[PDB]
Design a binder for this molecule. Structure first.
Ligand SMILES: CC(=O)N1CCc2cc([N+](=O)[O-])ccc21
Lengths: 86, 103, 141
């Protein structure tokens, strides 16, 4: 099962529920589809890549890579990550 | 191996994974389960290259090196309206602001 | 409180840096004080002569971002079995997306200028709360 996280500019992101429910904020907003009035698509796409990175490398001695953040999206990703705790 | 993909059409992006040995058609099945449209009504593309149903995602260039979790590879998606396919259209994401002087 | 045991019982260790950061090994001496050791470039190693019961933790040498050793926070060299050295496998944690952004932003803005970024006040206090061995040692206690 998948959920839909819609960014502030209309892009729809379809991620698995397990991935989205790792966020306490999104679990609350689901309890389906979730609109983020404040997160543009260049930030929500990074958020979703983080869900993938988290689920893949959580509890792994297979050396984990760095999660890359472009300097131009860092301040917005920070605000979104701060608002979602994830 | 798992390959990590963003299936993109218009303003839709599916984040999912698949095996390198999984086939293009099986990915069309995965899209079908999500977007509720049959494999025959879809075309998958690598960049601009239309992909063949019988080929594995590895043969189509999706590998653990290029379809990574924190940097997934994009698969273009096109739908057939009625007897005829739309052209591959992937709307770009929004543009970040100029880097502040502070950075 | 959180100190190395003075066992004087040698334990051979390999610090392995399976991270992309410059790793600062930190030994906790017998009074609990962090003692920094020579740094490890990414992917490099150092055979180190430690002792059973001793306490090591590992940090990014530049930012003091916390690293993991053998998938955990603290490394205590144990008895060498069959004479084979003990492996301290230093890896990147899965940082929260929040911590990671604080890392990237901390690294672009000189701390004098944190207050010139247009973000909520909670984030200035979060940015100014640098990762820190002293702070972490209290957390672990
Ligand atoms: C309350 C608040 O300020 N929020 C909510 C989440 C969020 C995201 C961005 N962003 O650019 O991703 C900017 C601002 C905010």
């Amino acid at each position: 099962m998948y959920v839909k996280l819609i960014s502030s500019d209309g892009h729809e992101f379809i991620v698995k529920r397990e991935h989205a429910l790792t966020s306490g904020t999104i679990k609350a907003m689901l309890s389906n589809e979730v609109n983020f009035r404040e997160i543009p698509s260049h930030v929500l796409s990074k958020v979703c890549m983080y869900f993938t990175y988290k689920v893949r490398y959580t509890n792994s001695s297979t050396e984990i890579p760095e999660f890359p953040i472009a300097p131009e999206i860092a301040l917005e990703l920070l605000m979104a990550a701060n608002f979602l705790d994830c | 191996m798992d390959v990590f993909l963003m299936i993109r059409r218009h303003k839709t992006t599916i984040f999912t994974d698949a095996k390198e040995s999984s086939t293009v058609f099986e990915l069309k099945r995965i899209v079908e389960g999500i977007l509720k449209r049959p494999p025959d009504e879809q075309r998958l593309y690598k960049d601009d290259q239309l992909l063949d149903d019988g080929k594995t995602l590895g043969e189509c260039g999706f590998t653990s090196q290029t379809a990574r979790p924190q940097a997934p590879a994009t698969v273009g998606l096109a739908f057939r309206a009625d007897d005829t396919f739309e052209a591959l259209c992937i709307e770009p994401f929004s543009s970040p602001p100029e880097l502040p002087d502070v950075m | 409180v959180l100190r190395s045991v003075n066992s004087r019982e040698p334990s051979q260790v390999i610090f392995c840096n399976r991270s992309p950061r410059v790793v600062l090994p930190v030994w906790l001496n017998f009074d609990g004080e962090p003692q920094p050791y020579p740094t490890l470039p990414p992917g490099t190693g150092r055979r180190i002569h430690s002792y059973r019961g001793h306490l090591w933790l590992f940090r990014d040498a530049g930012t003091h971002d916390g690293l993991l050793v053998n998938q955990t926070e603290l490394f205590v060299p144990s008895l060498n079995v069959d004479g084979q050295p003990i492996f301290a496998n230093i890896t990147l944690p899965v940082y929260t997306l929040k911590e990671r952004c604080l890392q990237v932003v901390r690294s672009l803005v000189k701390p004098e200028n944190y207050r010139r970024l247009d973000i909520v006040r909670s984030l200035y206090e979060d940015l100014e709360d640098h990762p820190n061995v002293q702070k972490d040692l209290e957390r672990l206690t």
